[PDB]
Amino acid sequence: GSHMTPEHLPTEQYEAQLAEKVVRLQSMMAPFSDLVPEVFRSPVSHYRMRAEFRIWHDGDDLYHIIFDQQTKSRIRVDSFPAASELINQLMTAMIAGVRNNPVLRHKLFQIDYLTTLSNQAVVSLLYHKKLDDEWRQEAEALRDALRAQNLNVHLIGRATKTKIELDQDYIDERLPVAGKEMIYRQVENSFTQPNAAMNIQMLEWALDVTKGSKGDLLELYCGNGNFSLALARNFDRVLATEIAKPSVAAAQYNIAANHIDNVQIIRMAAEEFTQAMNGVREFNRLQGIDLKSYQCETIFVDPPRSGLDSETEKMVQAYPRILYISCNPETLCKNLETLSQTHKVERLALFDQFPYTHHMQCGVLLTAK
RNA sequence: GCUGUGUUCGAUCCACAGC
């Protein structure tokens, strides 16, 4: 679905809210499987590690707002308990540091927060105005004021064609995954899973579903390497594709930082990779490595809401094992009308990444009929 | 310019993609 998340969380309803998503997934999946899904719960609050807010000016008072889904009307928000405690503390600080500093305040229309379990933060202040050395001066005092307070925090100043990194635009996550810690660089404006608690569990579920697998793994559009770097434990080698250049950078750093040897990141789109597979095309960039030398019986896929397009649909059907994580079971099911013809559902999970909303995250392991 | 995207609401405003 497409619900909003409210300032007040009906935590008393968490369990009922979940139960309905469980029964919902079950109906949706019925045409393809009779499996009783595995179900992973979110903590009932402070689960969301990034939040964005429009800012509203009330004369000299200003404040973050969200918008009512149905009516479009403006809701003033002093806290946001769905967001991490750190995002909460930074919400108060930011309004404090800007309230009566007119260069920081003027034309300040939204604030983006990015937060980690490891306790780092990246706050972006967006403007309908040009930014200059005067802005940069005051903005520099605000960060030291914040740091002053023991907040590991960077600041990004944005306006049209403008991006002032106080120092930088990434932070480093530390996630405990199946015993071993795990570093993940995360870049502002590049996709990350918003629910870190749920993320740990998707990683872990993927790790269990691909246990004792023979050979190699192929991941498409792997972002900062999230799943690939974890799954590298279960596979002799990993080949992971990504086009977005800061994601590729982050993913590269993430291999180094985790001392991983068995994963190669390839800067390639799905279409011009499959060309390298079936058919040929002597690639400028692949030159370093030999595809025929690799043996991928498992393909991994985690698309946006829209899901797999028809081309990709066909492409993954090539493989004996498909691992598909979704943030929209509706499109997973569309996909599955096709995928079910060639594959059976081996495993099934719900992940409650978006509590108190209609959205559902989930996962499926499909093996060739 | 135009279209599309952004895995909470939300963005002809911030960003990205395609053209």
From Swiss-Prot:
It comes from the Bacteria. One of its GO terms (molecular function) is rRNA binding. InterPro entries: MeTrfase_TrmA_AS, MeTrfase_TrmA_CS, SAM-dependent_MTases_sf, TrmA_MeTrfase, U5_MeTrfase_fam. Induction: Growth rate-dependent regulation of transcription. Is a novel example of a mRNA regulated through a mechanism similar to that of a stable RNA (rRNA). It holds the Pfam family tRNA_U5-meth_tr. Its EC number is 2.1.1.-, 2.1.1.35. Disruption phenotype: Cells lacking this gene exhibit a lack of m5U modification in tmRNA. The active site is at 327 (nucleophile), 361 (proton acceptor). It catalyses: uridine(54) in tRNA + S-adenosyl-L-methionine = 5-methyluridine(54) in tRNA + S-adenosyl-L-homocysteine + H(+); uridine(341) in tmRNA + S-adenosyl-L-methionine = 5-methyluridine(341) in tmRNA + S-adenosyl-L-homocysteine + H(+). It is an enzyme of class 2 (transferase). Belongs to the class I-like SAM-binding methyltransferase superfamily. RNA M5U methyltransferase family. TrmA subfamily. Dual-specificity methyltransferase that catalyzes the formation of 5-methyluridine at position 54 (m5U54) in all tRNAs, and that of position 341 (m5U341) in tmRNA (transfer-mRNA). PROSITE patterns: SAM_MT_RNA_M5U, TRMA_1, TRMA_2. GO terms for biological process: tRNA folding; tRNA methylation. GO terms for cellular component: cytosol. S-adenosyl-L-methionine binds at residues 193, 221, 226, 242, 302. The record marks 193, 302, 305 as: Interaction with RNA. The lineage of its organism: Bacteria, Pseudomonadati, Pseudomonadota, Gammaproteobacteria, Enterobacterales. This is tRNA/tmRNA (uracil-C(5))-methyltransferase. Keywords: Methyltransferase, S-adenosyl-L-methionine, Transferase, tRNA processing.
